Amino acid sequence: PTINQLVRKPRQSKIKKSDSPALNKGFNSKKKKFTDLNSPQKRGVCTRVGTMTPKPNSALRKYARVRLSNNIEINAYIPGIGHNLQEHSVVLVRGGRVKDLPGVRYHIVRGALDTSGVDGRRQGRSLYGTKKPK
Amino acid sequence: RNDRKVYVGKVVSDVLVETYKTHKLYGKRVKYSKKYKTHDENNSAKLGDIVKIQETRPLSATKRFRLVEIVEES
């Protein structure tokens, strides 16, 4: 555009959007209002664990339905081989969407709160909440 | 002593002191104007006259200037 057009109507950058919107909101119970805080993880309670089929891929991918501490419902993936989760489990939820699973944008942290570490894991244990053997 | 700010402008009601505000990003000069409610004493000036004003102590809720001299008659 012309300089005069830019003076009349300046440039405007596109607004960036967050990939984990449920983590960036808090809840004040006393005032019954939503805040904006940018948390790295959120506590939550498992409403419904289960499995889901992928979008070329084929498997039974384990996940849980979680009500986060800010009263938001999300689908969180359970990484690793075997888990100890069920209804009413207290879990820590972090960011990171799992491709091939539509509607699952978060991960459950292994080895935090009620979720156990992966059993028998020996490589990359810190990603799966497993203590060092022996 | 000390100097009080002086302006020159045109009466818009019986003073407009149009100035330039250079654009911060693009560098183009853009005209802007500010109306200075001023004290004329004996209602001497009229609409369109180009007048000189000087800063004074507050004279009313919005008057901070006194008309000192008329420059170009209406």
Add this chain to the structure above:
Amino acid sequence: AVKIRLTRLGSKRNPFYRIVVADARSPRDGRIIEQIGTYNPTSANAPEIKVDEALALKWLNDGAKPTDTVHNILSKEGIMKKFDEQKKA
């Protein structure tokens, strides 16, 4: 009142002091009127006093009062003697 006093600088267990003219109500390390020197009590050999003598007498003659330590510093630099001599004369 107006004071000539020491504001603390440096780090833990390693104090360094600037000599400042400040309002008594100002916080120790905050707003000052004018710095007039430094003072290093932990230096290797000499406490390293660095007073601006012309500035110190202007404030002393203007009613600024030193703290106890600053009075000793100004005395060690002869400023207190010149202040008393100039007051009588």
Add this chain to the structure above:
Amino acid sequence: ANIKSAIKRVKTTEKAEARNISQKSAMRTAVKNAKTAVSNNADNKNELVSLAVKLVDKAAQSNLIHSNKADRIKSQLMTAN
């Protein structure tokens, strides 16, 4: 309330407030009386003005009013006198 010197300050404030109220009231009475006496040209309008000026100066010395307010009050009577 809680602090010993704050508790004492409540008492000394009340004592000062009682003295200040009396002296302000008397000073305002004399000023009003002197103001009226001017608006009618009484025989003792000079004595009433001198009394009002005396009390206004004593109030300013007592910090009951500012010196600037005392000067403003003094002029209003004296120009009208």
Add this chain to the structure above:
RNA sequence: GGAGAGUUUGAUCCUGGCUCAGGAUGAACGCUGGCGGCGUGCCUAAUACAUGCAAGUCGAGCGAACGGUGUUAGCGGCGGACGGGUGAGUAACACGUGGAUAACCUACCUAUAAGACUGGGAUAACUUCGGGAAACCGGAGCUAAUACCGGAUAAUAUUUUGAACCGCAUGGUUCAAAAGUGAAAGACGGUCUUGCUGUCACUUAUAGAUGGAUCCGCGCUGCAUUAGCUAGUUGGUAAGGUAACGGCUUACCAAGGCAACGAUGCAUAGCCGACCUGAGAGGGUGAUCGGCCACACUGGAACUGAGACACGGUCCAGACUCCUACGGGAGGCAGCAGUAGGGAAUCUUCCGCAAUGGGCGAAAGCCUGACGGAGCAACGCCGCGUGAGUGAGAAGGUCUUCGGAUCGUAAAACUCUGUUAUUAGGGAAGAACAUAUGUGUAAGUAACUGUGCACAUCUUGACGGUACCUAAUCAGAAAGCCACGGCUAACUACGUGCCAGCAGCCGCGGUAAUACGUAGGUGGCAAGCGUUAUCCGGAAUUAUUGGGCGUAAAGCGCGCGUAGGCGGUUUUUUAAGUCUGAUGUGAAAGCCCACGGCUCAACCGUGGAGGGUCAUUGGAAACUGGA
């Protein structure tokens, strides 16, 4: 001082988004964890708060009481408006920067001058009689002061007469020259003469210094799917009011004032120095340190005071909590700790006033959760370890084209070291003083005491028996984390068989998987290593620097035309833009350069540089603007 790569196709070149490699954090989480230094540590609930501490001091202002020269409660003075916390509100002269006040106030401090005369009456304490569970309240008497109040003296302050001179309009500086009017205090010492006199204190006046107040230019977030707003509103007169100007308030008069240069409304936000990122232009943030503002359970007021409409004061209203003997009473951690709650998440109910600073005091000193330190946490940065030298292919693991290869000089073996660690011995600085005691000198004195200044002697360390140093003994206690198809440094075997699982992207797995899981090996880092979240970069992907619109997204269907933007040649003139000096200012800390101290380094300190679209002022005249 500027790096790219993957991904649309059978293949291509474009366009275009997406993703990745970098830096950073008040981080959190997972696995792991040796030390030292320096820093940092409730970002959420301005949620509610148990308990302790965070503001006193002065007996050289005063009376009394109790004790044997001391002390207690009280009166009185000063302080409690600082220091400390927090960021709720605020889009505003709140803040930044630059100015103005001829419209301002200022305790304590300093200097100068003139004074400090003469009377009086209260009242707390206290004693006594009561009333109340308590908090506390009544009656009777008593009494002091540097408490309070009369009178005298004091004018630069006020009124009027004027005058001279000057300014930026209101005006201002003097010169008078009359009329009213305004103060004060003693304490502790010396000499003694009960007179004089020292220090501190007191009054008035004038300056200085300090602090505060008001006004103005410019700068300050979104939303127009917010376009009308205002009626004390805008101006005037008068009065009132204030430290002060002013619709600041009221009365009357007039109908103005603001707005498309965005008024108003809604939402969001304390602002700045700084901080992160970036080649820069920019973009992002305001925790910590410093400046300014605002707030103190919510809302409204005022009192005292130099200063408050007052965090640990008062009054009132409200919500809530606590005691009650039901009449009544009490409270406010956004001080330091600490608790509960919320949360992914953020510490000890520690030590000391030794240092610096502050209040009170003549001083000794007292007070000081400011502050100086210690404690906890790999939260960050920096430094040092977890051994070193020699040592030919041992066993064991893994692979094997069962020859071998590799882990690997790695291990063991031989010597060596003690940073660290343990035990013991020594052990700084940080401390300057003040007081007191002597001398000397200056002012003053009639002289002395005292005061100022100088020298000499004296006491004082929370940390802490810490840092550090010395000796002995031992490689003995001290390595983990992620990755290895490509981007991208580093590959093999076995198990599994589109399962289990992996995944930032391309995608991998359906019986010979370098991508799943494990193992060996390797790579990258290392007391850390990874993951997540968030911001800048890469992104020229909002393009001023630095992009586009025939067919990729993009020319309004087309006129007329308002505001605005832009505008042919020459001469003279101006000086707003432009250019070029001067002056002032842009605090300190920070960044960058230099140097110095920390064993180095972090860090600390010192000296510079930088940063304005800043203001004021002197020049130039080509270009833009004005005539």
